[PDB]
Amino acid sequence: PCDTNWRYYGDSCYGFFRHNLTWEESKQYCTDMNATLLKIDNRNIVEYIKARTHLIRWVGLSRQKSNEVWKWEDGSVISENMFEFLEDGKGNMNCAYFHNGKMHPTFCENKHYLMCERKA
Amino acid sequence: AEDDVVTPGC
Ligand SMILES: *[C@H]1O[C@H](CO[C@]2(C(=O)O)C[C@H](O)[C@@H](NC(C)=O)[C@H]([C@H](O)[C@H](O)CO)O2)[C@H](O)[C@H](O[C@@H]2O[C@H](CO)[C@H](O)[C@H](O)[C@H]2O)[C@H]1NC(C)=O
């Protein structure tokens, strides 16, 4: 169901990548792989990813401006019951990564490792 | 699993 070395979980296939990229570069990277940055929209996926990696990795969450809503790459706003997992940030930290079970806003132009998602 | 993957040179 998944390309070689992509991990089969729930609906989807997950790829992990240790290239130090900005959020936008990471978005493009996933797009180049016919995939998207991760949507961490429930407790199950939090635990799956947490069990698998301890390194900071970008996810597909960003906001247009510090006073606008956080959205996933699919256009959806972050779910109510996932706010527990989102730490607060400063202004002009408009992109988020996942680290050891929580999501953290940071500078979009900082570089981090990443992971991508596509359908099986 | 994902973090310590050591890959051979080509
Ligand atoms: C062998 O590849 C590794 C990168 O490994 C991974 C990664 O990015 O973490 C392992 C992932 O599971 C795999 N993901 C998928 C979906 O398959 C990815 C993926 O194959 C690539 O990212 C796509 O480009 O690969 C290193 O790149 C490694 O290079 C060596 O890295 C060392 C520390 O990581 C150190 O920097 C070495 O000097 C460097 O050469 C590569 N091995 C070699 C010898 O080139």
Side-chain angles (χ1 to χ4, degrees), chain A residues 54-92:
Chain A
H54 319 266
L55 300 173
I56 289 166
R57 295 179 195 256
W58 283 127
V59 295
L61 196 73
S62 72
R63 65 188 174 194
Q64 204 57 23
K65 184 168 151 43
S66 73
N67 65 336
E68 293 176 27
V69 306
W70 291 103
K71 292 195 170 169
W72 295 112
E73 285 292 283
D74 66 0
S76 74
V77 176
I78 177 155
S79 281
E80 290 302 314
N81 66 13
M82 284 296 101
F83 267 124
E84 174 177 329
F85 298 89
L86 183 56
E87 303 286 271
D88 65 357
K90 314 303 182 153
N92 309 62

Short mmCIF file of all heavy atoms in Angstrom, two decimals, chain A residues 54-92:
data_model
loop_
_atom_site.label_atom_id
_atom_site.label_comp_id
_atom_site.label_asym_id
_atom_site.label_seq_id
_atom_site.Cartn_x
_atom_site.Cartn_y
_atom_site.Cartn_z
N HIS A 54 11.79 11.61 18.08
CA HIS A 54 12.04 12.52 19.19
C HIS A 54 12.70 13.80 18.73
O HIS A 54 13.11 14.63 19.54
CB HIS A 54 13.00 11.85 20.18
CG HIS A 54 12.70 10.41 20.40
ND1 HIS A 54 11.90 9.97 21.43
CD2 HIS A 54 13.05 9.31 19.69
CE1 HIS A 54 11.79 8.66 21.36
NE2 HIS A 54 12.47 8.23 20.31
N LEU A 55 12.85 13.94 17.42
CA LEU A 55 13.51 15.08 16.85
C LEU A 55 12.41 16.03 16.47
O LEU A 55 11.32 15.60 16.10
CB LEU A 55 14.29 14.70 15.61
CG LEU A 55 15.40 13.65 15.79
CD1 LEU A 55 15.95 13.26 14.43
CD2 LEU A 55 16.49 14.17 16.72
N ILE A 56 12.72 17.32 16.53
CA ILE A 56 11.81 18.36 16.05
C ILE A 56 11.54 18.12 14.57
O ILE A 56 12.48 18.02 13.78
CB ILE A 56 12.39 19.76 16.27
CG1 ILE A 56 12.37 20.08 17.78
CG2 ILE A 56 11.63 20.81 15.46
CD1 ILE A 56 13.19 21.26 18.21
N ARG A 57 10.26 18.03 14.20
CA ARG A 57 9.87 17.94 12.81
C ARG A 57 8.68 18.81 12.51
O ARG A 57 7.66 18.81 13.22
CB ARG A 57 9.56 16.49 12.40
CG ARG A 57 10.79 15.57 12.45
CD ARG A 57 10.42 14.17 12.08
NE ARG A 57 11.47 13.20 12.45
CZ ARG A 57 12.32 12.65 11.59
NH1 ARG A 57 12.29 12.93 10.29
NH2 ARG A 57 13.21 11.78 12.05
N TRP A 58 8.79 19.53 11.41
CA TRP A 58 7.71 20.39 10.94
C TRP A 58 6.44 19.60 10.71
O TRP A 58 6.50 18.43 10.28
CB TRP A 58 8.11 21.01 9.60
CG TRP A 58 9.09 22.16 9.61
CD1 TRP A 58 10.25 22.25 8.89
CD2 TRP A 58 8.95 23.40 10.31
NE1 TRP A 58 10.85 23.47 9.10
CE2 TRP A 58 10.06 24.20 9.96
CE3 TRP A 58 7.97 23.92 11.18
CZ2 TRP A 58 10.24 25.50 10.48
CZ3 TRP A 58 8.15 25.23 11.69
CH2 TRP A 58 9.28 26.00 11.32
N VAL A 59 5.29 20.24 10.95
CA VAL A 59 3.97 19.73 10.51
C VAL A 59 3.25 20.78 9.70
O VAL A 59 3.71 21.93 9.63
CB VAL A 59 3.07 19.23 11.67
CG1 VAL A 59 3.69 18.02 12.35
CG2 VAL A 59 2.75 20.32 12.68
N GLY A 60 2.12 20.41 9.09
CA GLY A 60 1.46 21.31 8.13
C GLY A 60 0.59 22.41 8.72
O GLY A 60 -0.39 22.81 8.09
N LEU A 61 0.95 22.95 9.88
CA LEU A 61 0.16 23.97 10.54
C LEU A 61 0.80 25.34 10.41
O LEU A 61 1.97 25.52 10.73
CB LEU A 61 -0.04 23.61 12.01
CG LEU A 61 -1.14 24.34 12.78
CD1 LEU A 61 -2.52 23.85 12.36
CD2 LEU A 61 -0.93 24.14 14.26
N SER A 62 0.03 26.33 9.96
CA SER A 62 0.53 27.68 9.84
C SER A 62 -0.62 28.67 9.91
O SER A 62 -1.80 28.31 9.71
CB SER A 62 1.27 27.87 8.52
OG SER A 62 0.38 27.89 7.44
N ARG A 63 -0.28 29.92 10.16
CA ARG A 63 -1.28 30.98 10.18
C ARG A 63 -0.79 32.13 9.32
O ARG A 63 0.40 32.41 9.26
CB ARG A 63 -1.57 31.43 11.61
CG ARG A 63 -0.40 32.08 12.32
CD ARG A 63 -0.73 32.30 13.79
NE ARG A 63 0.41 32.80 14.56
CZ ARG A 63 0.47 32.83 15.88
NH1 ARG A 63 -0.53 32.38 16.63
NH2 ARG A 63 1.55 33.32 16.47
N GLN A 64 -1.73 32.78 8.64
CA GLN A 64 -1.36 33.83 7.68
C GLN A 64 -0.65 34.97 8.38
O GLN A 64 0.30 35.54 7.86
CB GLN A 64 -2.61 34.34 6.96
CG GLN A 64 -2.33 34.97 5.61
CD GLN A 64 -1.62 34.02 4.65
OE1 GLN A 64 -1.68 32.78 4.80
NE2 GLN A 64 -0.93 34.59 3.66
N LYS A 65 -1.13 35.28 9.57
CA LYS A 65 -0.60 36.37 10.34
C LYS A 65 -0.84 35.97 11.78
O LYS A 65 -1.73 35.15 12.06
CB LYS A 65 -1.32 37.66 9.94
CG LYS A 65 -0.80 38.91 10.62
CD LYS A 65 -1.35 40.17 9.96
CE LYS A 65 -1.47 41.34 10.95
NZ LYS A 65 -0.28 41.50 11.85
N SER A 66 -0.05 36.52 12.69
CA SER A 66 -0.12 36.11 14.11
C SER A 66 -1.51 36.28 14.74
O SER A 66 -1.83 35.58 15.70
CB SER A 66 0.94 36.83 14.95
OG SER A 66 0.61 38.20 15.16
N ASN A 67 -2.33 37.17 14.20
CA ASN A 67 -3.69 37.34 14.70
C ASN A 67 -4.75 36.58 13.88
O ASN A 67 -5.95 36.88 13.99
CB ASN A 67 -4.05 38.83 14.81
CG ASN A 67 -4.10 39.56 13.47
OD1 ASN A 67 -3.47 39.15 12.49
ND2 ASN A 67 -4.84 40.66 13.44
N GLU A 68 -4.32 35.60 13.07
CA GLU A 68 -5.27 34.77 12.32
C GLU A 68 -5.18 33.34 12.78
O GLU A 68 -4.28 32.95 13.52
CB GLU A 68 -5.08 34.91 10.81
CG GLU A 68 -5.44 36.31 10.37
CD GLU A 68 -5.19 36.59 8.91
OE1 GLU A 68 -5.21 35.67 8.06
OE2 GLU A 68 -4.98 37.78 8.60
N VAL A 69 -6.14 32.55 12.33
CA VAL A 69 -6.28 31.21 12.84
C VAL A 69 -5.20 30.30 12.27
O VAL A 69 -4.74 30.46 11.13
CB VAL A 69 -7.70 30.67 12.57
CG1 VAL A 69 -8.75 31.65 13.11
CG2 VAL A 69 -7.92 30.44 11.08
N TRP A 70 -4.78 29.35 13.09
CA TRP A 70 -3.93 28.25 12.61
C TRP A 70 -4.74 27.32 11.71
O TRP A 70 -5.84 26.90 12.09
CB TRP A 70 -3.44 27.46 13.79
CG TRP A 70 -2.47 28.17 14.65
CD1 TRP A 70 -2.71 28.75 15.87
CD2 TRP A 70 -1.06 28.32 14.40
NE1 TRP A 70 -1.54 29.27 16.39
CE2 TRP A 70 -0.51 29.01 15.50
CE3 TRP A 70 -0.21 27.94 13.36
CZ2 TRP A 70 0.84 29.34 15.58
CZ3 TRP A 70 1.15 28.25 13.45
CH2 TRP A 70 1.65 28.94 14.55
N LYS A 71 -4.20 26.99 10.54
CA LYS A 71 -4.85 26.09 9.61
C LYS A 71 -3.92 24.95 9.21
O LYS A 71 -2.70 25.13 9.10
CB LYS A 71 -5.21 26.83 8.32
CG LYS A 71 -6.30 27.91 8.48
CD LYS A 71 -6.82 28.31 7.11
CE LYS A 71 -8.06 29.18 7.16
NZ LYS A 71 -8.36 29.76 5.82
N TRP A 72 -4.51 23.80 8.93
CA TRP A 72 -3.78 22.71 8.31
C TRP A 72 -3.63 22.94 6.82
O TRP A 72 -4.28 23.82 6.24
CB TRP A 72 -4.49 21.38 8.59
CG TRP A 72 -4.49 21.01 10.06
CD1 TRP A 72 -5.56 20.96 10.91
CD2 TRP A 72 -3.35 20.67 10.83
NE1 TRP A 72 -5.15 20.60 12.17
CE2 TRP A 72 -3.79 20.42 12.14
CE3 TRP A 72 -1.98 20.54 10.53
CZ2 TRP A 72 -2.91 20.02 13.16
CZ3 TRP A 72 -1.12 20.19 11.53
CH2 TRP A 72 -1.58 19.93 12.84
N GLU A 73 -2.79 22.14 6.18
CA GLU A 73 -2.58 22.25 4.75
C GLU A 73 -3.83 21.99 3.90
O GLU A 73 -3.90 22.46 2.79
CB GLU A 73 -1.44 21.34 4.30
CG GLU A 73 -0.08 21.89 4.71
CD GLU A 73 0.24 23.15 3.94
OE1 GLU A 73 0.62 23.04 2.76
OE2 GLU A 73 0.09 24.25 4.50
N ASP A 74 -4.80 21.25 4.44
CA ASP A 74 -6.05 20.97 3.75
C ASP A 74 -7.08 22.09 3.89
O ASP A 74 -8.23 21.93 3.47
CB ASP A 74 -6.64 19.62 4.21
CG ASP A 74 -7.09 19.62 5.66
OD1 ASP A 74 -6.96 20.66 6.34
OD2 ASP A 74 -7.58 18.56 6.13
N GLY A 75 -6.68 23.21 4.48
CA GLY A 75 -7.56 24.38 4.67
C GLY A 75 -8.39 24.38 5.95
O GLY A 75 -9.04 25.38 6.27
N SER A 76 -8.35 23.28 6.70
CA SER A 76 -9.14 23.15 7.93
C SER A 76 -8.49 23.87 9.11
O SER A 76 -7.26 23.93 9.21
CB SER A 76 -9.37 21.66 8.26
OG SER A 76 -8.21 21.01 8.75
N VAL A 77 -9.32 24.43 9.99
CA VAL A 77 -8.83 25.09 11.21
C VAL A 77 -8.53 24.00 12.23
O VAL A 77 -9.10 22.91 12.19
CB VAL A 77 -9.85 26.13 11.77
CG1 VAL A 77 -9.39 26.74 13.08
CG2 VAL A 77 -10.06 27.23 10.77
N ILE A 78 -7.60 24.26 13.12
CA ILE A 78 -7.26 23.24 14.10
C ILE A 78 -8.47 22.95 15.01
O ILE A 78 -9.20 23.88 15.40
CB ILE A 78 -5.96 23.58 14.87
CG1 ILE A 78 -5.67 22.53 15.94
CG2 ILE A 78 -6.00 24.98 15.46
CD1 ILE A 78 -4.20 22.44 16.28
N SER A 79 -8.68 21.67 15.29
CA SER A 79 -9.81 21.16 16.08
C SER A 79 -9.75 21.66 17.51
O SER A 79 -8.67 21.87 18.04
CB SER A 79 -9.79 19.63 16.15
OG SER A 79 -10.30 19.03 14.97
N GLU A 80 -10.92 21.80 18.14
CA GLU A 80 -11.01 22.25 19.52
C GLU A 80 -10.19 21.36 20.44
O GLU A 80 -9.34 21.85 21.17
CB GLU A 80 -12.47 22.31 20.00
CG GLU A 80 -13.28 23.43 19.34
CD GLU A 80 -12.68 24.81 19.57
OE1 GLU A 80 -12.32 25.09 20.74
OE2 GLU A 80 -12.56 25.60 18.59
N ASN A 81 -10.43 20.05 20.38
CA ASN A 81 -9.79 19.12 21.31
C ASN A 81 -8.30 18.84 21.02
O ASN A 81 -7.72 17.97 21.66
CB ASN A 81 -10.60 17.82 21.46
CG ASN A 81 -10.66 17.00 20.18
OD1 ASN A 81 -9.93 17.24 19.23
ND2 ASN A 81 -11.54 16.00 20.17
N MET A 82 -7.71 19.59 20.08
CA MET A 82 -6.28 19.53 19.80
C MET A 82 -5.52 20.77 20.30
O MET A 82 -4.29 20.81 20.25
CB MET A 82 -6.03 19.35 18.29
CG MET A 82 -6.28 17.94 17.76
SD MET A 82 -5.16 16.69 18.43
CE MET A 82 -6.17 15.92 19.68
N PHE A 83 -6.25 21.78 20.78
CA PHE A 83 -5.62 22.99 21.34
C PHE A 83 -4.79 22.68 22.57
O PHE A 83 -3.80 23.34 22.84
CB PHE A 83 -6.67 24.03 21.73
CG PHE A 83 -6.95 25.04 20.66
CD1 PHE A 83 -8.25 25.24 20.20
CD2 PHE A 83 -5.92 25.82 20.15
CE1 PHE A 83 -8.51 26.19 19.22
CE2 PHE A 83 -6.17 26.77 19.18
CZ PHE A 83 -7.47 26.96 18.71
N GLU A 84 -5.22 21.67 23.33
CA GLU A 84 -4.44 21.17 24.46
C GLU A 84 -3.00 20.88 24.06
O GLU A 84 -2.08 21.12 24.83
CB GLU A 84 -5.08 19.90 25.01
CG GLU A 84 -4.26 19.22 26.10
CD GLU A 84 -4.93 18.00 26.69
OE1 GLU A 84 -6.18 17.97 26.74
OE2 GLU A 84 -4.19 17.08 27.11
N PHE A 85 -2.81 20.37 22.84
CA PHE A 85 -1.49 19.99 22.35
C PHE A 85 -0.68 21.12 21.69
O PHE A 85 0.45 20.88 21.25
CB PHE A 85 -1.64 18.82 21.38
CG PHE A 85 -2.23 17.58 22.01
CD1 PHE A 85 -3.60 17.38 22.04
CD2 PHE A 85 -1.40 16.62 22.56
CE1 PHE A 85 -4.14 16.25 22.63
CE2 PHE A 85 -1.93 15.48 23.15
CZ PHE A 85 -3.31 15.29 23.18
N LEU A 86 -1.23 22.33 21.63
CA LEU A 86 -0.59 23.44 20.95
C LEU A 86 -0.10 24.46 21.97
O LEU A 86 -0.90 25.03 22.70
CB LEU A 86 -1.57 24.11 19.97
CG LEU A 86 -1.01 25.28 19.14
CD1 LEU A 86 0.23 24.89 18.33
CD2 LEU A 86 -2.08 25.85 18.22
N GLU A 87 1.21 24.67 22.01
CA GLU A 87 1.79 25.63 22.94
C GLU A 87 1.58 27.02 22.38
O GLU A 87 1.34 27.18 21.19
CB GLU A 87 3.28 25.35 23.12
CG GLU A 87 3.57 23.93 23.60
CD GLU A 87 3.22 23.73 25.05
OE1 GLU A 87 4.11 23.96 25.88
OE2 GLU A 87 2.07 23.32 25.34
N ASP A 88 1.65 28.04 23.23
CA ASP A 88 1.44 29.40 22.74
C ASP A 88 2.75 29.94 22.19
O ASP A 88 3.84 29.51 22.59
CB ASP A 88 0.82 30.32 23.83
CG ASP A 88 1.74 30.54 25.03
OD1 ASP A 88 2.85 29.96 25.07
OD2 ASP A 88 1.35 31.31 25.94
N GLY A 89 2.66 30.87 21.25
CA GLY A 89 3.84 31.44 20.63
C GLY A 89 3.81 32.96 20.70
O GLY A 89 2.88 33.54 21.27
N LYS A 90 4.82 33.58 20.13
CA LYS A 90 4.90 35.02 20.06
C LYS A 90 4.36 35.45 18.71
O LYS A 90 4.01 34.61 17.87
CB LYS A 90 6.35 35.48 20.17
CG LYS A 90 7.16 34.82 21.29
CD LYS A 90 6.53 35.00 22.66
CE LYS A 90 7.40 34.37 23.74
NZ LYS A 90 7.23 35.00 25.08
N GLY A 91 4.32 36.75 18.50
CA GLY A 91 3.98 37.28 17.19
C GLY A 91 5.08 36.93 16.22
O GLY A 91 6.23 36.77 16.58
N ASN A 92 4.70 36.83 14.95
CA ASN A 92 5.61 36.44 13.89
C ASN A 92 6.29 35.08 14.07
O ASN A 92 7.29 34.85 13.42
CB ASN A 92 6.64 37.55 13.62
CG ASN A 92 5.98 38.91 13.41
OD1 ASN A 92 5.33 39.44 14.31
ND2 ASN A 92 6.15 39.49 12.21
#
